């Protein structure tokens, strides 16, 4: 997809932003329901305002044209809601708008049909009872997955956008299936968590990196999903997370060679919680959040500004005489969730701590 490049360096961009401000946090977000969001809001907004949003996920606007942004958008949204992708995959958009506001319907109609996300009008007077249909929208369409998302409110709240992604994994190669033995998790030198860890031997898509100090394994998911771990050798995190980059992703998933290997692999689920006005502000998105926005797209008589951005991102585990090399995911390690058909980045993350909340 012509986006694939762009949507990887915002992976990129968000990813080192979060771990430049805690090396101790568990990082798990989308890269691609994150953009998603933010393209189809910025249908409702003009000049300084849409600008920054479009430049905020990677796009150089001198470069590529505004139309093949949003259809290569809506070309990642048909793959992702295909059957197969939908058994496992489930992404969504709220957007809560304050009731008495007269809204554009080209809008409305646009955000529906190209971006299949959907809009409310919510009464922000009391805004106890609006924080409650937020997160009842959020919990229905999760089937009660995610719970208590917006947790407060802002008093002048007018606008909010809440966007969550839960993702059903599942290895799609069928696997000896052996018990999910209780094994040692080094967060770091003095602390240690207990994890279920499954033991394999057997032909993997697995290999040690030179640039990048780490061992490097692949995997392949139900819903055309294949994930890269990044396994970083002693003292070399900070190390791996300045090597990586898009060309060199896009050679691991090239790569289809395979060797004996002894795995230790943690049968982790995880999620993140992100306020993206917050996040989003550090890499440049702030006018759509201020007075200043220019929302005349979603509103044209009165002033209008989104309030609260809130992202979700859920992952639950559903289910040669040579020695070969043992290798064990029991310390931090960083990933990429990818879609097969895309090359897009699904999830993008770090586990520090696997029992960490
Ligand atoms: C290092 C491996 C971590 C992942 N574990 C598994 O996929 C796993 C482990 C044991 C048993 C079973 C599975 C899959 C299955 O079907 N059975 C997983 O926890 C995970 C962690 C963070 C990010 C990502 Cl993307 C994912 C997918």
Known sequence: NKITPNLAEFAFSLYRQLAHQSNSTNIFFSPVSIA???????????????????????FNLTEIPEAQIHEGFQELLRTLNQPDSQLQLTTGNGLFLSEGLKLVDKFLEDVKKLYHSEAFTVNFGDTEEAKKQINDYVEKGTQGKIVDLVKELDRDTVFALVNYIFFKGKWERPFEVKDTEEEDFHVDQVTTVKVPMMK???????????????????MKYLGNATAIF??????????????????????FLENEDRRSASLHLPKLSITGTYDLKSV?????????????????????????????????????????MSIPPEVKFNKPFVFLMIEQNTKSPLFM?????????
């Open 36 to 58: 998603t969001a933010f393209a189809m809001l910025s249908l409702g907004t003009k000049a300084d305002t849409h600008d920054e949003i479009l430049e905020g996920l990677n």
């Open 349 to 357: 993350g770090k586990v520090v701590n696997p029992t960490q909340k």
């Open 280 to 320: 989003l502000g550090q890499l440049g998105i702030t006018k759509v959040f201020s007075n200043g926005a220019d929302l005349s797209g979603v509103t044209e008589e009165a002033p209008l500004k989104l309030s609260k951005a809130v992202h979700k991102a859920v992952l639950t585990i559903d289910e040669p």
């Open 200 to 218: 394999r031997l057997g032909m993997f898509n697995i290999q040690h990196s030179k640039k990048l100090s780490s061992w490097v394994l692949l």
């Open 230 to 251: 990044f396994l970083p050798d002693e003292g070399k995190l900070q190390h791996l997370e300045n090597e990586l980059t898009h060309d060199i992703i896009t050679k």
